Design a protein around this nucleic acid. Structure first.
Ligand SMILES: [Mg+2]
Ligand SMILES: [Mg+2]
Ligand SMILES: [Mg+2]
Ligand SMILES: [Mg+2]
Ligand SMILES: [Mg+2]
Ligand SMILES: [Mg+2]
Ligand SMILES: [Mg+2]
Ligand SMILES: [Mg+2]
Ligand SMILES: [Mg+2]
Ligand SMILES: [Mg+2]
Ligand SMILES: [Mg+2]
Ligand SMILES: [Mg+2]
Ligand SMILES: [Mg+2]
Ligand SMILES: [Mg+2]
Ligand SMILES: [Mg+2]
Ligand SMILES: [Mg+2]
Ligand SMILES: [Mg+2]
Ligand SMILES: [Mg+2]
Ligand SMILES: [Mg+2]
Ligand SMILES: [Mg+2]
Ligand SMILES: [Mg+2]
Ligand SMILES: [Mg+2]
Ligand SMILES: [Mg+2]
Ligand SMILES: [Mg+2]
Ligand SMILES: [Mg+2]
Ligand SMILES: [Mg+2]
Ligand SMILES: [Mg+2]
Ligand SMILES: [Mg+2]
Ligand SMILES: [Mg+2]
Ligand SMILES: [Mg+2]
Ligand SMILES: [Mg+2]
Ligand SMILES: [Mg+2]
Ligand SMILES: [Mg+2]
Ligand SMILES: [Mg+2]
Ligand SMILES: [Mg+2]
Ligand SMILES: [Mg+2]
Ligand SMILES: [Mg+2]
Ligand SMILES: [Mg+2]
Ligand SMILES: [Mg+2]
Ligand SMILES: [Mg+2]
Ligand SMILES: [Mg+2]
Ligand SMILES: [Mg+2]
Ligand SMILES: [Mg+2]
Ligand SMILES: [Mg+2]
Ligand SMILES: [Mg+2]
Ligand SMILES: [Mg+2]
Ligand SMILES: [Mg+2]
Ligand SMILES: [Mg+2]
Ligand SMILES: [Mg+2]
Ligand SMILES: [Mg+2]
Ligand SMILES: [Mg+2]
Ligand SMILES: [Mg+2]
Ligand SMILES: [Mg+2]
Ligand SMILES: [Mg+2]
Ligand SMILES: [Mg+2]
Ligand SMILES: [Mg+2]
Ligand SMILES: [Mg+2]
Ligand SMILES: [Mg+2]
Ligand SMILES: [Mg+2]
Ligand SMILES: [Mg+2]
Ligand SMILES: [Mg+2]
Ligand SMILES: [Mg+2]
Ligand SMILES: [Mg+2]
Ligand SMILES: [Mg+2]
Ligand SMILES: [Mg+2]
Ligand SMILES: [Mg+2]
Ligand SMILES: [Mg+2]
Ligand SMILES: [Mg+2]
Ligand SMILES: [Mg+2]
Ligand SMILES: [Mg+2]
Ligand SMILES: [Mg+2]
Ligand SMILES: [Mg+2]
Ligand SMILES: [Mg+2]
Ligand SMILES: [Mg+2]
Ligand SMILES: [Mg+2]
Ligand SMILES: [Mg+2]
Ligand SMILES: [Mg+2]
Ligand SMILES: [Mg+2]
Ligand SMILES: [Mg+2]
Ligand SMILES: [Mg+2]
Ligand SMILES: [Mg+2]
Ligand SMILES: [Mg+2]
Ligand SMILES: [Mg+2]
Ligand SMILES: [Mg+2]
Ligand SMILES: [Mg+2]
Ligand SMILES: [Mg+2]
Ligand SMILES: [Mg+2]
Ligand SMILES: [Mg+2]
Ligand SMILES: [Mg+2]
Ligand SMILES: [Mg+2]
Ligand SMILES: [Mg+2]
Ligand SMILES: [Mg+2]
Ligand SMILES: [Mg+2]
Ligand SMILES: [Mg+2]
Ligand SMILES: [Mg+2]
Ligand SMILES: [Mg+2]
Ligand SMILES: [Mg+2]
Ligand SMILES: [Mg+2]
Ligand SMILES: [Mg+2]
Ligand SMILES: [Mg+2]
Ligand SMILES: [Mg+2]
Ligand SMILES: [Mg+2]
Ligand SMILES: [Mg+2]
Ligand SMILES: [Mg+2]
Ligand SMILES: [Mg+2]
Ligand SMILES: [Mg+2]
Ligand SMILES: [Mg+2]
Ligand SMILES: [Mg+2]
Ligand SMILES: [Mg+2]
Ligand SMILES: [Mg+2]
Ligand SMILES: [Mg+2]
Ligand SMILES: [Mg+2]
Ligand SMILES: [Mg+2]
Ligand SMILES: [Mg+2]
Ligand SMILES: [Mg+2]
Ligand SMILES: [Mg+2]
Ligand SMILES: [Mg+2]
Ligand SMILES: [Mg+2]
Ligand SMILES: [Mg+2]
Ligand SMILES: [Mg+2]
Ligand SMILES: [Mg+2]
Ligand SMILES: [Mg+2]
Ligand SMILES: [Mg+2]
Ligand SMILES: [Mg+2]
Ligand SMILES: [Mg+2]
Ligand SMILES: [Mg+2]
Ligand SMILES: [Mg+2]
Ligand SMILES: [Mg+2]
Ligand SMILES: [Mg+2]
Ligand SMILES: [Mg+2]
Ligand SMILES: [Mg+2]
Ligand SMILES: [Mg+2]
Ligand SMILES: [Mg+2]
Ligand SMILES: [Mg+2]
Ligand SMILES: [Mg+2]
Ligand SMILES: [Mg+2]
Ligand SMILES: [Mg+2]
Ligand SMILES: [Mg+2]
Ligand SMILES: [Mg+2]
Ligand SMILES: [Mg+2]
Ligand SMILES: [Mg+2]
Ligand SMILES: [Mg+2]
Ligand SMILES: [Mg+2]
Ligand SMILES: [Mg+2]
Ligand SMILES: [Mg+2]
Ligand SMILES: [Mg+2]
Ligand SMILES: [Mg+2]
Ligand SMILES: [Mg+2]
Ligand SMILES: [Mg+2]
Ligand SMILES: [Mg+2]
Ligand SMILES: [Mg+2]
Ligand SMILES: [Mg+2]
Ligand SMILES: [Mg+2]
Ligand SMILES: [Mg+2]
Ligand SMILES: [Mg+2]
Ligand SMILES: [Mg+2]
Ligand SMILES: [Mg+2]
Ligand SMILES: [Mg+2]
Ligand SMILES: [Mg+2]
Ligand SMILES: [Mg+2]
Ligand SMILES: [Mg+2]
Ligand SMILES: [Mg+2]
Ligand SMILES: [Mg+2]
Ligand SMILES: [Mg+2]
Ligand SMILES: [Mg+2]
Ligand SMILES: [Mg+2]
Ligand SMILES: [Mg+2]
Ligand SMILES: [Mg+2]
Ligand SMILES: [Mg+2]
Ligand SMILES: [Mg+2]
Ligand SMILES: [Mg+2]
Ligand SMILES: [Mg+2]
Ligand SMILES: [Mg+2]
Ligand SMILES: [Mg+2]
Ligand SMILES: [Mg+2]
Ligand SMILES: [Mg+2]
Ligand SMILES: [Mg+2]
Ligand SMILES: [Mg+2]
Ligand SMILES: [Mg+2]
Ligand SMILES: [Mg+2]
Ligand SMILES: [Mg+2]
Ligand SMILES: [Mg+2]
Ligand SMILES: [Mg+2]
Ligand SMILES: [Mg+2]
Ligand SMILES: [Mg+2]
Ligand SMILES: [Mg+2]
Ligand SMILES: [Mg+2]
Ligand SMILES: [Mg+2]
Ligand SMILES: [Mg+2]
Ligand SMILES: [Mg+2]
Ligand SMILES: [Mg+2]
Ligand SMILES: [Mg+2]
Ligand SMILES: [Mg+2]
Ligand SMILES: [Mg+2]
Ligand SMILES: [Mg+2]
Ligand SMILES: [Mg+2]
Ligand SMILES: [Mg+2]
Ligand SMILES: [Mg+2]
Ligand SMILES: [Mg+2]
Ligand SMILES: [Mg+2]
Ligand SMILES: [Mg+2]
Ligand SMILES: [Mg+2]
Ligand SMILES: [Mg+2]
Ligand SMILES: [Mg+2]
Ligand SMILES: [Mg+2]
Ligand SMILES: [Mg+2]
Ligand SMILES: [Mg+2]
Ligand SMILES: [Mg+2]
Ligand SMILES: [Mg+2]
Ligand SMILES: [Mg+2]
Lengths: 147, 97
RNA sequence: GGGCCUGACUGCGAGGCCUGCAAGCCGAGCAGGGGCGAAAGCCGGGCCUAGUGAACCGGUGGUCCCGUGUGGAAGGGCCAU
RNA sequence: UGGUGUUGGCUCUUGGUCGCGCCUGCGUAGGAUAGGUGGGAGCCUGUGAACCCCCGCCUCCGGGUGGGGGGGAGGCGCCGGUGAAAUACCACCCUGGCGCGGCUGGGGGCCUAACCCUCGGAUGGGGGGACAGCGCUUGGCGGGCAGUUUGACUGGGGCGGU
RNA sequence: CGUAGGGUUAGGCGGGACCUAAGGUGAAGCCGAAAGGCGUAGCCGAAGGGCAGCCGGUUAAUAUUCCGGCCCUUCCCGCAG
RNA sequence: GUAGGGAAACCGAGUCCGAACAGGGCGCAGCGGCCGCAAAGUCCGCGGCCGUGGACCCGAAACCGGGCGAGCUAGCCCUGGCCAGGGUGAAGCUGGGGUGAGACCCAGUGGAGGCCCGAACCGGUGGGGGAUGCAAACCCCUCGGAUGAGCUGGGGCUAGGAGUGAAAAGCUAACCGAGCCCGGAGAUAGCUGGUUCUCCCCGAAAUGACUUUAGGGUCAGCCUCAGGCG
RNA sequence: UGGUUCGUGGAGCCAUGGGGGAAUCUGGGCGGACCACCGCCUAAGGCUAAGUACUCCGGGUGACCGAUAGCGCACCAGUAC
RNA sequence: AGCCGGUAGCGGGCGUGGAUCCCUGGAUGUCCGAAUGGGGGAACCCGGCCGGCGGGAACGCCGGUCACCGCGCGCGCGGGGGGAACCUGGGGAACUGAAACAUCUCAGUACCCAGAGGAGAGGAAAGAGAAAUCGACUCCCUGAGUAGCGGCGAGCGA
């Protein structure tokens, strides 16, 4: 008897998957405990539409990001800071890089998304990765400069 | 013993025929009927309990239509069934046939 | 008692015995293919009268007759048992 | 009372089987243990040879195969010995056996949720539990009950006889 | 016996507007081809439980029933506590 | 009806068996003067007999269906009631005695019991009577039980292959080895009985064979009618 | 298992109590086991006048009865009993 | 043109201003009965709610209303019970016949039950069955006692 699993189930199968069990098992355990549903045509349709709808919003995020590879990766964020020689008096934070990135070049970003362990404290040419989606890692080139 | 609430299968009467002797097809003289008496063949009725609308509905149904009970439960989702009595749920369920 | 043989025939069968029926019995002759005999001829089991069982159902060998739209097949018929 | 439905989960042990990894085969004769039928005239080796020792495993008592370590540029064919068929190397398939697996049949254990019982309390607890019950089907026991049969002749009938 | 006419008077007797018994019936619920069979509650069900009337007089014919005398029950309303 | 023969294919005044041009089975063939007459055959009427129906009428004992009955009787259930009078005198208890204590013994008291006698009441032993009764089970005399497995009123439940039964196949509404009513139903009856006006002609049989047959049948024999023969 | 003429038969068809269990016209059922060929038909939803049956009722008509007949009842009968 | 039923009588009335009588419609219609407020030994008993009567609160009477089941959003609709035969469906004997009897027969009859209705059933091919055919169903004639079925018996019979 074909049922659609609603959960991962030890050596039976994975959530969303279509497996074959003895009718007894399905009727008197699986179904009553919410763990699965009959592979009817009508709810086979539905599982298909979910697979379909998830796959839309996923490949639609792997596009919202890839497009944000195009806005960045094709610029340099330039940050003037009061500094002397190479060491800065204050510092450039990710929270700063973001609030910078909005003012010039327009793009809004999430500070917290940016891979910056400790606030930058030296002038120079920095390459900082963004990660707005796993698998879609962005290169943000940031020139921290004096005056 | 009795009636399937789903299929309508009822007890039927059948003869029980007792025979003797060797079939012709096996080279025998032929079969002789040594008795015919009436008997009944009952549907294989069993209980299926189902929760529908948080109520426990139970059906007496021939084993062949055990899957038709669950199919009814499915068609039940489109229904405004809560608050009803289990007599009332079963009526709605049944009406879906 | 001996020799050769398989007529302990196949297809029939005039005419009878007996007889409520159904049975039972005897049977010359013709044809086919044979046996014995030089031949005449004899031989369709046994000197004779008991040693038996209708029909139904079924088995087996044969025939190749019927075959449920058609060709087959199933199943039957027919002859023998 | 067998099969099957209602009827499920895990496991162990056995049996069937397919899917793999595999190993496995000892007549005269021929080096050594030659399973078939082809591909085959070459293969292998720092993916470390000839050979030295210890363990496993079947053991025709001759070995075979599987491992560990030195040595670490060597070994077997084709030819021919050769027998029915002959050697390196790659297959497709057997004899038998092993371990993984599927798919299953039989037994054993355990589980719970079908089903049954039960609990002032009940979308729950407890107990039995895939048994029992109940459907269909198999064969059996079965004067508890049912329908019947149980001859004729005859110095009456029976008994005897026929 | 035929025809006619008369005659049976209750808050207190009996039964009902009270209770339950066996049993019956029967929401719930269970079962059964149909008819129908069961079934805790409940309801019904009495010669059991409960409940207030005694004595006398009177009629042709009724009387714990009418009358007389002496007693009593429940319900409604009210007043008082 | 006009074609039959053959299991059939099939052939056809033939056909079947058969090798058969054999043999056989079963089949095939009007009167008068083209006219009329008759006729195969077939339709209708009438009559005899046959088959199927209840089939000439009446009669079972029984079988089956569905109902009606426990106001009789049997058992049980609920709730009530009844059992004169008399007798015997269990346990216990008290006191006395006994003993180490006891058992136990005696007396009084007590009032047990499918105990006794005997009415009511319940029975029905023996005898007599009754016998078209007083009575479809009675009467008289006698006799059993009579605190119990007692008797009894009211209210209930159990029934037909079923109930109920201290068991007799008893009882279940005056006949129970399977209740009664209605139905199947006009069961069946190879048996018994009955079978209705008149005249006229003829006129048997009671045997043989066979028969779950023997007092019933089939055939034959024997009777009768019509047609033909002579 | 039933239905059919079909009683297990060579037993199809229609129906279905049990088990198993599809497909959507290149689908399916059928033409008497089965197979092929050739055909017929479209299952698993429902309705549908009329032509047909009957006679409590009304009427018409009898080679039907005529009070033991004709209905059980001509009548106060499903009565008395 | 008579009339106040059978039904005369006593004792009274009515009718050509159209009676009695006949037909149609309507009104009234105690109680019981499916019986339905509840009970019950049918034709009796006992209630709730609203309204009314009486002096009326007790008590009693009058009118209205109150069973259960099904279907549809408490309210609507419907059901229930009867009917001589006929009809369908669900169940379903036996005597008897087989000159015994079991299969078979009787017979899917008798009968019980449910359901309908003036009829009911069936009905518009997943048919027939051999015709290159027919064209729903029902009913009559015929096909035919054929085909077949059958302890290949008795019989049964498309
Ligand atoms: Mg059987
Ligand atoms: Mg056979
Ligand atoms: Mg054969
Ligand atoms: Mg037979
Ligand atoms: Mg279940
Ligand atoms: Mg099934
Ligand atoms: Mg199934
Ligand atoms: Mg010679
Ligand atoms: Mg002769
Ligand atoms: Mg003769
Ligand atoms: Mg010669
Ligand atoms: Mg010769
Ligand atoms: Mg010679
Ligand atoms: Mg001769
Ligand atoms: Mg001799
Ligand atoms: Mg002899
Ligand atoms: Mg016979
Ligand atoms: Mg015979
Ligand atoms: Mg034969
Ligand atoms: Mg054919
Ligand atoms: Mg042929
Ligand atoms: Mg055919
Ligand atoms: Mg061919
Ligand atoms: Mg041919
Ligand atoms: Mg062949
Ligand atoms: Mg043959
Ligand atoms: Mg043959
Ligand atoms: Mg022969
Ligand atoms: Mg011959
Ligand atoms: Mg069994
Ligand atoms: Mg099982
Ligand atoms: Mg356990
Ligand atoms: Mg447990
Ligand atoms: Mg449990
Ligand atoms: Mg346990
Ligand atoms: Mg089991
Ligand atoms: Mg069950
Ligand atoms: Mg089986
Ligand atoms: Mg059996
Ligand atoms: Mg017996
Ligand atoms: Mg026996
Ligand atoms: Mg009989
Ligand atoms: Mg015998
Ligand atoms: Mg006998
Ligand atoms: Mg006897
Ligand atoms: Mg005998
Ligand atoms: Mg005798
Ligand atoms: Mg004698
Ligand atoms: Mg005699
Ligand atoms: Mg004699
Ligand atoms: Mg004598
Ligand atoms: Mg004598
Ligand atoms: Mg004898
Ligand atoms: Mg003798
Ligand atoms: Mg008088
Ligand atoms: Mg008074
Ligand atoms: Mg009183
Ligand atoms: Mg009152
Ligand atoms: Mg009362
Ligand atoms: Mg009460
Ligand atoms: Mg009851
Ligand atoms: Mg009760
Ligand atoms: Mg009360
Ligand atoms: Mg009382
Ligand atoms: Mg009292
Ligand atoms: Mg009182
Ligand atoms: Mg007083
Ligand atoms: Mg008096
Ligand atoms: Mg008086
Ligand atoms: Mg007074
Ligand atoms: Mg006060
Ligand atoms: Mg001839
Ligand atoms: Mg001739
Ligand atoms: Mg003529
Ligand atoms: Mg005759
Ligand atoms: Mg008749
Ligand atoms: Mg007659
Ligand atoms: Mg006659
Ligand atoms: Mg009679
Ligand atoms: Mg009798
Ligand atoms: Mg009998
Ligand atoms: Mg009997
Ligand atoms: Mg009876
Ligand atoms: Mg009865
Ligand atoms: Mg009594
Ligand atoms: Mg009594
Ligand atoms: Mg008492
Ligand atoms: Mg008493
Ligand atoms: Mg006494
Ligand atoms: Mg006394
Ligand atoms: Mg006394
Ligand atoms: Mg004392
Ligand atoms: Mg003392
Ligand atoms: Mg004493
Ligand atoms: Mg005493
Ligand atoms: Mg005394
Ligand atoms: Mg005594
Ligand atoms: Mg005594
Ligand atoms: Mg006395
Ligand atoms: Mg007294
Ligand atoms: Mg007595
Ligand atoms: Mg006496
Ligand atoms: Mg005496
Ligand atoms: Mg006496
Ligand atoms: Mg006497
Ligand atoms: Mg006397
Ligand atoms: Mg007497
Ligand atoms: Mg006396
Ligand atoms: Mg005395
Ligand atoms: Mg006495
Ligand atoms: Mg005495
Ligand atoms: Mg006594
Ligand atoms: Mg006494
Ligand atoms: Mg006494
Ligand atoms: Mg006594
Ligand atoms: Mg007593
Ligand atoms: Mg009593
Ligand atoms: Mg009584
Ligand atoms: Mg009593
Ligand atoms: Mg009883
Ligand atoms: Mg009873
Ligand atoms: Mg009764
Ligand atoms: Mg009886
Ligand atoms: Mg008996
Ligand atoms: Mg009987
Ligand atoms: Mg009994
Ligand atoms: Mg007794
Ligand atoms: Mg006896
Ligand atoms: Mg009686
Ligand atoms: Mg009696
Ligand atoms: Mg009897
Ligand atoms: Mg009686
Ligand atoms: Mg009746
Ligand atoms: Mg009859
Ligand atoms: Mg009759
Ligand atoms: Mg008889
Ligand atoms: Mg006569
Ligand atoms: Mg004479
Ligand atoms: Mg004689
Ligand atoms: Mg004789
Ligand atoms: Mg003889
Ligand atoms: Mg004979
Ligand atoms: Mg006789
Ligand atoms: Mg004769
Ligand atoms: Mg003569
Ligand atoms: Mg003459
Ligand atoms: Mg079948
Ligand atoms: Mg049949
Ligand atoms: Mg046959
Ligand atoms: Mg068939
Ligand atoms: Mg089925
Ligand atoms: Mg097609
Ligand atoms: Mg297909
Ligand atoms: Mg089909
Ligand atoms: Mg088929
Ligand atoms: Mg076919
Ligand atoms: Mg067809
Ligand atoms: Mg067709
Ligand atoms: Mg219809
Ligand atoms: Mg029309
Ligand atoms: Mg019509
Ligand atoms: Mg008519
Ligand atoms: Mg009339
Ligand atoms: Mg006249
Ligand atoms: Mg008269
Ligand atoms: Mg009369
Ligand atoms: Mg007269
Ligand atoms: Mg009349
Ligand atoms: Mg009369
Ligand atoms: Mg009268
Ligand atoms: Mg008058
Ligand atoms: Mg006058
Ligand atoms: Mg006058
Ligand atoms: Mg006028
Ligand atoms: Mg009117
Ligand atoms: Mg009134
Ligand atoms: Mg009424
Ligand atoms: Mg009422
Ligand atoms: Mg009522
Ligand atoms: Mg009021
Ligand atoms: Mg007043
Ligand atoms: Mg008032
Ligand atoms: Mg008033
Ligand atoms: Mg009122
Ligand atoms: Mg009222
Ligand atoms: Mg009804
Ligand atoms: Mg009706
Ligand atoms: Mg029927
Ligand atoms: Mg039905
Ligand atoms: Mg039936
Ligand atoms: Mg019927
Ligand atoms: Mg029966
Ligand atoms: Mg019979
Ligand atoms: Mg009869
Ligand atoms: Mg007959
Ligand atoms: Mg007989
Ligand atoms: Mg007979
Ligand atoms: Mg007999
Ligand atoms: Mg019989
Ligand atoms: Mg008959
Ligand atoms: Mg029949
Ligand atoms: Mg009838
Ligand atoms: Mg009706
Ligand atoms: Mg009509
Ligand atoms: Mg119609
Ligand atoms: Mg209709
Ligand atoms: Mg259509
Ligand atoms: Mg014809
Ligand atoms: Mg025959
Ligand atoms: Mg028949």
């Amino acid at each position: 008897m074909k049922v659609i699993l609603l959960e991962p189930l030890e050596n039976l199968g994975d959530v969303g998957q279509v497996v074959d069990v003895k009718p007894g098992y399905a009727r008197n355990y699986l179904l009553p405990r919410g763990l699965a549903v009959l592979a009817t045509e009508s709810n086979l349709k539905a599982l298909e539409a979910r697979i379909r709808a998830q796959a839309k919003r996923l490949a639609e995020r792997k596009a919202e990001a890839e497009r944000l590879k195009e806005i960045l990766e094709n610029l340099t964020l330039t940050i003037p800071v009061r500094a002397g020689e190479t060491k800065i008096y204050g510092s450039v934070t990710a929270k700063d890089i973001a609030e910078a990135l909005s003012r010039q070049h327009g793009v809004t970003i999430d500070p917290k998304r940016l891979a910056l362990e400790k606030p930058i404290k030296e002038l120079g040419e920095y390459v900082l990765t963004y990660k707005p989606h796993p698998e879609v890692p962005i290169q943000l080139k940031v020139s921290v400069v004096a005056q | 013993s009795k009636v399937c609430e789903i299929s309508g299968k009822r007890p039927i009467v059948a003869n029980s025929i007792q025979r003797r002797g060797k079939a012709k097809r096996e080279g025998g003289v032929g079969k002789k009927t040594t008795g015919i008496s009436k008997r009944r063949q009952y549907p294989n009725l069993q209980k299926v309990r189902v929760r529908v609308a948080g109520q426990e509905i139970t059906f007496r149904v021939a084993a062949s239509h055990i899957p038709k009970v669950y199919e009814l439960v499915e068609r039940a989702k489109g229904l405004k069934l809560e608050g009803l009595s289990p007599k009332e749920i079963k009526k709605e369920l049944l009406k879906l046939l």
